[PDB]
Design a protein around this ligand. Structure first.
Ligand code: MG
Ligand code: ZN
Lengths: 1319, 652
DNA sequence: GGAGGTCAAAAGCGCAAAAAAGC
RNA sequence: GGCUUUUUUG
DNA sequence: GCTTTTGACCTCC
């Protein structure tokens, strides 16, 4: 079964893998993000509500007054999208917020309210997203790309010893908050722990430890293990367990209860550990020499003397042992300090602590944060507190806290936005464990540590910054308390927030100018992920690791589609099925596998979870019951790819297409292409130019329909029905009975854009693709946009190509193209240019626009009206005049055609400031626009009044008035008629008054439209009025253009060749492109040969259908053929039966297939060569796909048969007339007197420094001396050069470059004296 | 400078000067009333800050920023750096009489000329046209001449053609890596809007026809014109300065044409007959009466310069093919016939061309190169060599071989299950097994592809070198190598992780057939690395060149002889295996520091202060001298220069 | 007492193009 | 005509 | 951020 739109031309496709999940809405990453930013969230966790709850309520310093938030809404936009685009105003919505002002008595208990005041407050204009996920700022369309940055949390990284000579590995731990100051813990080559904040001077770590009110004893308790000693008779015995014997050497014979357990002198052994644990002995004596290396854990003082016998973190000797024995200190606490297991890391840092009382510690912190300042204790305490524990100045966000807890093996994932002592302690402990071999470092490039930030988050961040500024302002204002004099609106000033949001949307790193010259470009532009921008890497700062592709990129970002050159691997594009998680992590679909059966259940898996399961392959051969046909299948588990049994699998890929982006997925036969050539093929396919008339690609992928429909370039039926009136500019759709609303059903109208400039000077055009009086359903395609054909993406044309060297005209990469291509206008494009003339008010008289021009012949005024603006349709050329603007001196400042560009004027737009008289030309355009708008509105009026009067006649027939008498009477007389039945009379007068209601609201919308059109346009200050002119040019292909295929075989047209010279086969049909075979093997993009072969069969089926149509053979035998073509193939998923099709549908489909049957091919489930041969056999074509050809010039048969087929060719956006220019003598720069640069400025080229070296390498000195002095800047001498040339004498004058004198003065502008010398 | 509207454009210099002068005025006014010292200290200090910012912004600390929030330019900022005065407006500066365009191949041009669009030529030579119009009297005032130029009158094109007969122009392509990046040409007027270029020199520019753009400059004076003609003309640049190797080597399409010309078939139409000469042989091929390549006997005549610079004729019969006889016409007199009797791949043909330059000077060798290019293009076009899907012959054994390899690993993994092998042992074992399987498959594929059977004259199968299109385009060296042919038919081979580890499971599929999803994925690890390295190597490498130029830009040869005996000994470099560089090339083209002494004691093989060349080097080879001490530039004694003999022989 | 070790600051990091905006 | 920001090609 | 280099302060012998 099919809807009626695709029944017009069913595109046959190969492919053996059934679809489980169809392609989602391609734009869901963008649009669904912004919906989180303006919808009302009762929970207060998303967008504006969450932003408001984080600043409000605000209380005065005295606390007698506060301001509270109530609710908000977004007002209706003043204009729609089209009016904003034409007028150059930002499509935006006003912001309404209900604020509450509460006053407290200072003489009453707290909470006693003096008065309350409720009032909505204007807060500014918020830009609003259009229907296609774009933004409109100043008549243009800008789209916000999605950033990709380091996930807030904590990471452990190792530098691999590169920075040190010995290569010893150093470990560091970093905590990256969502907003606030960082924190770094590092190990030095001396193996001591240090802490630093915000990349400042490195500081000993223990400084922070005591800053949290920790004594030395507490630190040693937290970071080490205790060893206890008891004073027995002349002995210091200790309790020993086997577990604490790892990696130790028995200095003496380990024995207890009089039995020797361990040998003496050598290292410990596991067998001795086993026998000791079997004995289960705890206490053991130790000699004195073994205690010579241990460190006391705690402090010891004498009760009698009261003096410190020995403090903690201090080595002990036999004399200290004597004091502790004579003082009664029986129990001695020491540190375990096993270097191979528990290194003395913290103790050594303790040994280098400058102070211990935490006062000088806070002083040191405060000095380090800001050098050269008085160290006030309270100031230092406040600095530390608001540095790492203030709720406003530091915030870790929900996702950061979740990552922090997950990394530290905690369980609860909900917490505060500020840190805690325990969290820092835990991070330190895990860093020590990492140093001890336990655990493993994290990976930066892993997609589990990087998140996707959309437009919503960025808008929220800008809004919060603005809100902080305005709340500081209102707090300052409220500090000067007043006895309820003000209303809760004066203190709130919307200018800061409005300016902040506007500047972020307008001028920023990521707000980019959308390049919409074909639907694929703008789709793949909306779906871009960038690692640049605020809070990310720069173009140079990135190393060789971020650029490279990581094994967790499977299914989430396209590995083969990315810009090439200065930033590669930083602008990777999102995949097809991938969608962002709730936290902001990329995740992909998968199918659950239970008991070797693959169900249709779909689970979305993020990066981290992908590391725990076993994932099968997309094209894993499968039975009819979900059982894997082998017991051995290919799978991937953790970045590896290995065989597995049928029972260890858990998930399988949804479809074979889920690895590449859209741009790569549009490339047929991708599975036979090198990665480099596929990359360049996609990147060039993104840059096609719309053709004058579009043609379907014969060999596509099959998702062109999805790409075209998803992008907003083709009008789509909102409600199904039957088409009523069709026009080259408007379409009228009457809705069906079921789909109409209960009231005011009416009809639906679509207005089509015709020849409006794009953002790269190409033409946006729409042509209806439906006829009069045929049904349409919901979601069909009614009007094809640019480069679209029946709702199918169509970038370029399809040309009859042959691979053979031809007298060198296609020597290296060039293409030789026959004249029959340019005769049929298959590549001539339309380019539209824009010119603007401004009228300001300067001195010496303002800028006036009129037809009065001095010192000009009547030729320059023939193409001008009496109002001073060119007529619509004049064939203007270079150097002519468009808008006559003069300034009294009269100064001829009128706008002129830029040199070298011709065209035909198609539209003129005039903008006038409010309160300014409009000239007659603006009056004409205004009245014409009003007339067209009233024509439209009166058309809807006629339809609606006809409907309501049909209702009225239905009422009146039942009322008693005869139908014939009704019909004879005039239209408006039906209301005044009398009806005997009261309710029928009541219904008649009621309809006459909703007649009145309808006409009156039509009248008020009339007056509103008339006022808006007459309403003065908002302009820049100091500007009176501006005028704009549009120019239309048709470009044809000429030697030097850039044409390219889809697989990366670009090139340049060499020579347009007369048709009689091209090679031709036995049938006499020439080939109109002659490519070059030598570029296939080395480039190794063998996909193009297979595509050529497949296309050659596509026209083979097309020609036969053409033969039957010419002979007008019966539908029965025709219907027989078409069905046989579709059934061809092995286990093809698509099955089409033409029995259900009626004869008319079959005939229309056949005549629509006349130019060749489209053949589709999924990206990685392509058609093999066997069915290609089979399809070729269906026609009368040779199976090998190599026919003979005859030379056009000689008529001699080519010795070896060559390849002929149909290849899809795009014309790139690189035209010669946009790049070829030359200069003899033009303008000159004002400062250095060197000629200008750039084609638009008519300047010469740059004799580069490398060119100077190369010209120095020759003996050529005179030419270099020319380049330096005469042709560049010797203003005194270069004039003499011109005069000499005209006289015939070829000689120069050296002179001295003027640019050197400037520098002289400039050096003299400092205190340096530099001067020349004598001759 | 004023823009549209009442606003004015102001530079950073004006703002800083205004600030400093205003502060000076304020302090000088405040000092007159003798304010308390606390006031004057701050004013003087912050005036110091203002002057500091004036002379150099951002050196001391926080920099002065404007409305753009970015630091303002200062005097020190306007001298240093790429945007400063020196590197942007003194060492390189924009010029007049220049233009830009897109490159396009032209086969019909000769070696010493290039195309030019009409509009570019007219715009460039407009100053020259004005003078010539005055001389012929077509217009008297310069205004009149300018008027008739823009109308494109019929006389304008005639006078332009007359004035551009021998006016050389310069062609360069940024970046100009080596000195061959700028070459002179003699323009010829063509239609269209693209610049036409000769194919042979495209290798020197490293320029391909995929949208690369050229710039043209025009010399003015007689000194400049003669300088260009005698130094930078194309015909004077055939040996690269880096090394003696030629720079006009034919490539790609021409090579395939020559290869297809000279290759016999075991049987063909018109095989086994006798032909009078090459002139007659061309008559047979065009008439279709004999195949382009079939072994015959032809009378040929070759000349030798073996006498005292004189050519002597000789005549006999040689057993060759029709195509070789056709090719023999364009070879000049001196060369022997054996040089044009082999398969004539890429490596051979250049060699042959080089021999001409060794014997026939310059004019014959350039004419011969041009004739080679013409004939190659013509007979490659008439050949019709095309690539199809069936040309990729997939070896039959390949499939089963993979099975065997599988069985091998099926055992090795078991050894890990039993614990008898470690991770490293298994890894190395599977790596070796897969590498051996790859080598076997590649060898089998090449052996199957490179030969084919065709019936001879007596009706028996005979093996000849195959005429498959891919093999022809690979063996001739026209384009590609055995690695790519491996990539098409046999397995792709082992692929690497980003860090450097080798994946244990190789890609068993080839490009002719399909690649399942994960194989294509793991194949992109290497390609992204290659693209990233290629993109980021051009930034580092080019910069390095700069540092080399500024160090060595003071070196010019100034004196003939320095008169020192000091030098460095030269020996063939050896690591213990084969010689990496023999003694021949290292010492070639230098001067002997001391006389070369024979292994026989007290015999003078080579006199002191004698340049070495082919006539002296072969003498060393026959005599088998071990090592020689040669004079070198590092030891020359002349100050502020380099001895002429010390530098040795100019390689150009 | 000083010669050695270790930490802190400045300077650089292709070239051509084009296209736009904005200041 | 200077600077800033991107995008793209080589 | 890379990397180098150079200067300046600490300090171990
Ligand atoms: Mg190129
Ligand atoms: Zn010398």
């Amino acid at each position: 079964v099919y809807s009626y739109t695709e029944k017009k031309r069913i595109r046959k496709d190969f492919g053996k893998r059934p679809q489980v999940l169809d392609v989602p809405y391609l734009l869901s990453i963008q649009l669904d993000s912004f919906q989180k930013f303006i919808e009302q969230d009762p929970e207060g966790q998303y967008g504006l509500e969450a932003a408001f709850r984080s600043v409000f309520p605000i209380q005065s310093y005295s606390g007698n007054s506060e301001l509270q938030y109530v609710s908000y809404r977004l007002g209706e936009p003043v204009f729609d999208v089209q009016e904003c685009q034409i007028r150059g105003v930002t499509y935006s919505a006003p912001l309404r917020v209900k604020l509450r002002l509460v006053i407290y008595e200072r003489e009453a208990p707290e909470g006693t309210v003096k008065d309350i005041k409720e009032q909505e407050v204007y807060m500014g204009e918020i830009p609003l997203m259009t229907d296609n996920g774009t933004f409109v700022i100043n008549g243009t369309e800008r789209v916000i790309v999605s950033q990709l940055h380091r996930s807030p949390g904590v990471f452990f990284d190792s530098d691999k010893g590169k920075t040190h000579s010995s290569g010893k590995v150093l470990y560091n731990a970093r905590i990256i908050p969502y907003r606030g100051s960082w924190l770094d813990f590092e190990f030095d080559p001396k193996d001591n722990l240090f802490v630093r904040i915000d990349r400042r001077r490195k500081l000993p770590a223990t400084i922070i430890l005591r800053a949290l009110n920790y004594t030395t004893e507490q630190i040693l308790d937290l970071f080490f293990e205790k060893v206890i000693f008891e004073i027995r008779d002349n002995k210091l015995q200790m309790e020993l367990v086997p577990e604490r014997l790892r990696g130790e050497t028995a200095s003496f014979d380990i024995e207890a209860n009089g039995k020797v357990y361990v040998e003496k002198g050598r290292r410990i052994t596991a067998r001795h550990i086993r026998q000791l644990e079997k004995d289960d002995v705890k206490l053991i004596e130790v000699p004195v020499e073994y205690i010579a290396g241990k460190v006391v854990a705690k402090d010891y003082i004498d009760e009698s003397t009261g003096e410190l016998i020995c403090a903690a973190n201090m080595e002990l000797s036999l004399d200290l042992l004597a004091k502790l024995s004579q003082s009664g200190h029986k129990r001695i606490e020491t540190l375990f300090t096993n270097d191979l297991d528990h290194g003395p890391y913290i103790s050594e840092t303790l040994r280098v602590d400058p102070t211990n009382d935490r006062l000088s510690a806070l002083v040191e912190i405060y000095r380090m944060m800001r050098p050269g300042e008085p160290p006030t204790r309270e100031a230092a305490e406040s600095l530390f507190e608001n540095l790492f524990f203030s709720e406003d100045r530091y915030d870790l966000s929900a996702v950061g806290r979740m990552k922090f807890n997950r990394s530290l093996l905690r369980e609860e994932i909900e917490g505060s936005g500020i840190l805690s002592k325990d969290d820092i302690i835990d991070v330190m402990k895990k860093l020590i464990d990492i140093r001890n071999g336990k655990g493993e470092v994290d990976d930066i490039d892993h997609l589990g540590n990087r998140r996707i930030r959309s437009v919503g988050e960025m808008a929220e961040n800008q809004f919060r910054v603005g809100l902080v500024r305005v709340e500081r302002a209102v707090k300052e204002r409220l500090s000067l308390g007043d006895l309820d004099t003000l209303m809760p609106q004066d203190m709130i000033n919307a200018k800061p927030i409005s300016a902040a949001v506007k500047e972020f949307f307008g001028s920023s790193q990521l707000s980019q100018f959308m390049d919409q010259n074909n639907p694929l470009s703008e789709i793949t532009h909306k779906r871009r992920i960038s690692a640049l921008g605020p809070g990310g890497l720069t173009r140079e700062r990135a190393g060789f690791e971020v650029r490279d592709v990581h094994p967790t990129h499977y299914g989430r970002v396209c590995p083969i589609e990315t810009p090439e050159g200065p930033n590669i691997g930083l602008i990777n594009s999102l995949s097809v099925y991938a969608q962002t998680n709730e936290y902001g992590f990329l995740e992909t679909p998968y199918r659950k596998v239970t008991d070797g059966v693959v169900t249709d259940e779909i689970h979305y898996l993020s990066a981290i979870e992908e590391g725990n399961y076993v994932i099968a392959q997309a094209n894993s051969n499968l039975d009819e019951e979900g059982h894997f046909v082998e017991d051995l299948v290919t799978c991937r588990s953790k970045g590896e790819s290995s065989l597995f049994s049928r029972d260890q699998v858990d998930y399988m890929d949804v479809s074979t297409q889920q690895v590449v982006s859209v741009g790569a997925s549009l490339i047929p036969f991708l599975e036979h292409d090198d990665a480099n050539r596929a990359l360049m093929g996609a990147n060039m396919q993104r840059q096609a130019v719309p053709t004058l008339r579009a043609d379907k690609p014969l060999v596509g992928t099959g998702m062109e329909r999805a790409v075209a429909v998803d992008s907003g370039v083709t009008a789509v039926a909102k409600r199904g029905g039957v088409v009523q009136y069709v026009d080259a500019s408007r379409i009228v759709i009457k809705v069906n009975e079921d789909e109409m609303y209960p009231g005011e059903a009416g009809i639906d109208i679509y207005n089509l854009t015709k020849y409006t400039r794009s953002n790269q000077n190409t033409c946006i055009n729409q042509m209806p693709c439906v006829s009069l009086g045929e049904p349409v359903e919901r979601g069909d395609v009614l009007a094809d946009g640019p480069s679209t054909d029946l709702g199918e993406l169509a970038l370029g044309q399809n040309m009859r190509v042959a691979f053979m060297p031809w007298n060198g005209y296609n020597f290296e990469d060039s293409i030789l193209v026959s004249e029959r291509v340019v005769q049929e206008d298959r590549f001539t494009t339309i380019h539209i240019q824009e010119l603007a003339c401004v009228s300001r008010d300067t001195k010496l008289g303002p800028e006036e626009i009129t037809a009065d021009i001095p010192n000009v012949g009547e030729a320059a005024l023939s193409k001008l009206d009496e109002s001073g603006i060119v007529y619509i349709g004049a064939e203007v050329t270079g150097g002519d005049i468009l808008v006559g603007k003069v300034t009294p001196k009269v100064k001829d400042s009128s706008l002129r055609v830029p040199n070298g560009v011709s065209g035909t004027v198609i539209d003129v737009q005039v903008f006038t400031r409010d309160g300014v008289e409009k000239d007659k030309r603006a009056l004409e355009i205004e009245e014409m626009q009003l007339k067209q708008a009233k024509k439209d509105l009166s058309e809807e009026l006629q339809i609606l009044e006809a409907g309501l009067f049909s209702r009225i006649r239905a009422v009146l027939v039942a009322g008693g008035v005869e139908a014939e008498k009704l019909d004879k009477l005039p239209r408006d007389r039906w209301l005044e008629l009398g009806l005997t039945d009261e309710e029928k009379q009541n219904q008649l007068e009621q309809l006459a008054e909703q007649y009145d209601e309808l006409k009156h609201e039509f009248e008020k919308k009339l007056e509103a439209k008339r006022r808006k059109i007459t309403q003065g346009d908002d302009l820049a200050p100091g500007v009176l009025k501006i005028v704009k002119v549009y120019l239309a040019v048709k470009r044809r292909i000429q030697p030097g253009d850039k044409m390219a295929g889809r697989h990366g075989n670009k090139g340049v047209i060499s020579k347009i060749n007369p048709i009689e010279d091209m090679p031709y086969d036995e049938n006499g049909t020439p080939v109109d492109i002659v490519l070059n075979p030598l570029g296939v093997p080395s480039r190794m993009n063998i996909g193009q040969i297979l595509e050529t072969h497949l296309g050659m069969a596509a026209k083979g089926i097309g020609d036969k259908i053409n033969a039957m149509l010419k002979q007008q053979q019966e539908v029965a035998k025709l219907r027989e053929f078409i069905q046989r073509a579709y059934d061809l193939g092995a286990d093809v998923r698509q099955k089409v039966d033409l029995s259900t099709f009626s004869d008319e549908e079959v005939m229309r489909l056949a005549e629509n297939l006349r130019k060749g049957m489209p053949i589709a091919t999924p990206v990685f489930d392509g058609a093999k060569e066997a069915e290609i041969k089979e399809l070729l056999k269906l026609g009368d074509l040779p199976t090998s796909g190599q026919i003979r050809l005859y030379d056009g010039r000689t008529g001699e048969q080519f010795e070896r048969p060559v390849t002929v087929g149909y290849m899809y060719m795009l014309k790139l956006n690189h035209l010669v007339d946009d790049k070829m220019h030359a200069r003899s003598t033009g303008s000159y720069s004002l400062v250095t007197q060197q000629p200008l640069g750039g084609k638009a400025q008519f300047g010469g080229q740059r004799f580069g420094e490398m060119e100077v070296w190369a010209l120095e390498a020759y003996g050529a000195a005179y030419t270099l001396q020319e380049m330096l002095t005469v042709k560049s800047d010797d203003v005194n001498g270069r004039t003499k050069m011109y005069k000499n040339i005209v006289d015939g004498n070829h000689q120069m004058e050296p002179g001295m470059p003027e640019s050197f004198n400037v520098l002289l003065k400039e050096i003299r502008s400092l205190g340096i004296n530099i001067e020349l010398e004598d001759e | 400078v004023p823009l549209d509207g009442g606003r004015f454009a102001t530079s950073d210099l004006n703002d800083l000067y205004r600030r400093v002068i205003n502060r000076n005025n304020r302090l000088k006014r405040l000092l007159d009333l003798a304010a308390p010292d606390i006031i004057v200290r701050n004013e003087k200090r912050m005036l110091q800050e203002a002057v500091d910012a004036l002379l150099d912004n951002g050196r001391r600390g926080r920099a002065i920023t404007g409305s753009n929030k970015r630091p303002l330019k200062s005097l020190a900022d306007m001298i240093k750096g790429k945007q400063g005065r020196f590197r942007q407006n003194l060492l390189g500066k924009r010029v007049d009489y220049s233009g830009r365009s897109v490159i396009t191949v032209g086969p019909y041009l000769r070696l010493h000329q290039c195309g030019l669009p009409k509009k570019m030529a007219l715009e460039l030579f407009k100053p020259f046209i004005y003078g010539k119009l005055e001389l012929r009297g077509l217009a008297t005032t310069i205004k009149a001449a300018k008027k008739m130029v823009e109308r494109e009158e019929a006389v304008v094109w005639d006078i332009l053609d007359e004035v551009i007969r021998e006016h050389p122009v310069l062609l360069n392509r940024a970046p100009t890596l080596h000195r061959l990046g700028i070459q002179a040409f003699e323009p010829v007027l063509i239609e269209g809007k693209a610049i036409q270029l000769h194919p042979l020199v495209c290798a020197a520019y490293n320029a391909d026809f995929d949208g690369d753009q050229m710039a043209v400059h025009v010399p003015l004076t007689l000194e400049a014109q003669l300088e260009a003609r005698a130094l930078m003309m194309s015909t004077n640049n055939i040996l690269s300065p880096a090394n003696g190797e030629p720079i006009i080597v034919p490539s790609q399409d021409v090579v395939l044409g020559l290869y297809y010309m000279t290759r016999d078939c075991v049987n063909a139409k018109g095989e086994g007959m006798v032909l009078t000469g090459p002139k007659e042989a061309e008559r047979l091929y065009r008439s279709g009466l004999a195949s382009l390549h079939a072994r015959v006997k032809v009378r040929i005549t070759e000349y030798e310069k073996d006498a005292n610079g004189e050519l002597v004729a000789k005549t006999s019969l040689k057993d060759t093919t029709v195509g070789r006889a056709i090719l023999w016409m364009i070879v000049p007199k001196g060369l022997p016939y054996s040089i044009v009797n082999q398969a004539l791949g890429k490596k051979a043909i250049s060699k042959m061309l080089n021999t001409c330059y060794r014997i026939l000077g310059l004019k014959p060798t350039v004419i011969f190169a041009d004739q080679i290019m013409y004939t190659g293009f013509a007979y490659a076009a008439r050949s019709g060599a095309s690539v199809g899907i069936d040309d990729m012959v997939i070896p039959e054994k390949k499939h089963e071989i993979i099975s065997e390899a599988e069985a091998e690993v099926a055992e090795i993994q078991e050894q890990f299950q039993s614990g008898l092998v470690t991770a490293g042992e298994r890894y190395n074992k599977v790596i070796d097994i897969w590498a051996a399987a790859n080598d076997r498959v590649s060898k089998a594929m090449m052996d199957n592809l490179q030969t084919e059977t065709v019936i001879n004259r007596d009706g028996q199968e005979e093996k000849q070198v195959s005429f498959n299109s891919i093999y022809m385009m690979a063996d001739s060296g026209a384009r590609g190598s055995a690695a790519q042919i491996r990539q098409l038919a046999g397995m792709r081979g082992l692929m690497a992780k980003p860090d450097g580890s080798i994946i244990e499971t190789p890609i068993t599929a080839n490009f002719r057939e399909g690649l399942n999803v994960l194989q294509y994925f793991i194949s992109t690890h290497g390609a992204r690395k290659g693209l990233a390295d290629t993109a980021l190597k051009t930034a580092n490498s080019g910069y390095l060149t700069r540092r080399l130029v500024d160090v060595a830009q003071d070196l010019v040869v100034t004196e003939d002889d320095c008169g020192t005996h000091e030098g460095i000994m030269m020996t063939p470099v050896i690591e213990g295996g084969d010689v990496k560089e023999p003694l021949r090339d290292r010492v070639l083209g230098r001067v002997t520091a001391e006389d070369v002494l024979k292994p026989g004691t007290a015999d003078i093989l080579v006199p002191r202060n004698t340049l070495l060349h082919e006539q002296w080097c072969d003498l060393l080879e026959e005599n088998s001298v071990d090592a020689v001490k040669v004079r070198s530039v590092v030891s020359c004694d002349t100050d502020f220069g380099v001895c002429a003999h010390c530098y040795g022989r100019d390689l150009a």
